[PDB]
Write a protein that binds this ligand. Structure first.
Ligand SMILES: CCCCCCCC/C=C\CCCCCCCC(=O)N[C@@H](CO[C@@H]1O[C@H](CO)[C@@H](O)[C@H](O)[C@H]1O)[C@H](O)/C=C/CCCCCCCCCCCCC
Ligand code: NI
Length: 203
């Protein structure tokens, strides 16, 4: 299934969002390299934390905007470096990395001298989504992941394990997934900017 479409007023229901993005971390089990373990843990850990907050009062935390706004009231000067707000601040970055990476691949972006690597696509996604927030030690993790990254064809076979679809059919399904996914992430970014909740610290 696809993510829910964005409503006209751009308020994103928490429950459906968490349920949908909860399907993303299992993909990492298809990628054998040791770095995918802490990557999966990071993404899943943030999902878990936002879910834990949501579950304390689903009515009050019905939308992601509710989460930020209510946490701001709950935590005073500790906000936004607190709670589900912090978890979602980092989740959105992981989700944008995925967005940019997959979009790049689907649009045929490549290094003409290495057309079956995915380095250029991962580098674009990293620069757009994560690099500004990573100190050198974490950047080394990215660099090592790049070196060991699967070939494009292998990667796409993993995305479509279970489906028996062609590479081109796999890309078409990703393009459709990307529609509501991209729109939703863009709203989450806007929300953090509007609330002055984007933090710029490096890890
Ligand atoms: C259709 C479905 C498609 C699925 C396909 C998925 C393919 C995706 C591949 C990789 C996704 C990578 C996402 C990584 C997100 C990392 C977020 C991050 O920077 N989290 C930080 C901060 O952590 C935060 O610290 C905070 C406190 O300061 C805490 O409060 C937070 O809870 C905590 O999250 C953490 O320090 C870093 C974790 C790992 C960084 C990995 C760097 C890049 C990975 C290499 C990618 C190459 C891909 C090649 C293709 C296979
Ligand atoms: Ni689902």
């Amino acid at each position: 299934h696809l993510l829910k479409p964005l409503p006209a007023d751009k308020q994103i229901e928490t429950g459906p969002f968490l349920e949908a993005v909860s399907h993303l971390p299992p993909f990492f089990d298809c990628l054998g390299s040791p770095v995918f373990t802490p990557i999966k843990a990071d993404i899943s850990g943030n999902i878990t934390k936002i879910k834990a907050v949501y579950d304390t009062n689903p009515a009050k935390f019905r939308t992601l905007q509710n989460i930020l706004e209510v946490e701001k009231e709950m935590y005073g000067a500790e906000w936004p470096k607190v709670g589900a707000t912090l978890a979602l601040m980092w989740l959105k970055r992981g989700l944008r990395f995925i967005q940019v990476f997959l979009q790049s691949i689907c649009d045929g972006e490549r290094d003409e001298n290495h057309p079956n690597l995915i380095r250029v696509n991962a580098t674009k996604a990293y620069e757009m989504a994560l690099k500004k927030y990573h100190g050198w030690i974490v950047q080394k993790i990215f660099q090592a992941a790049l070196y060991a990254a699967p070939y494009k064809s292998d990667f796409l076979k993993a995305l479509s394990k279970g489906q028996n679809v062609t590479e081109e059919e796999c890309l078409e399904k990703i393009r459709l997934f990307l529609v509501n996914y991209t729109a939703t992430i863009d709203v989450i970014y806007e929300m953090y900017t509007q609330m002055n909740a984007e933090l710029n610290y490096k890890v």
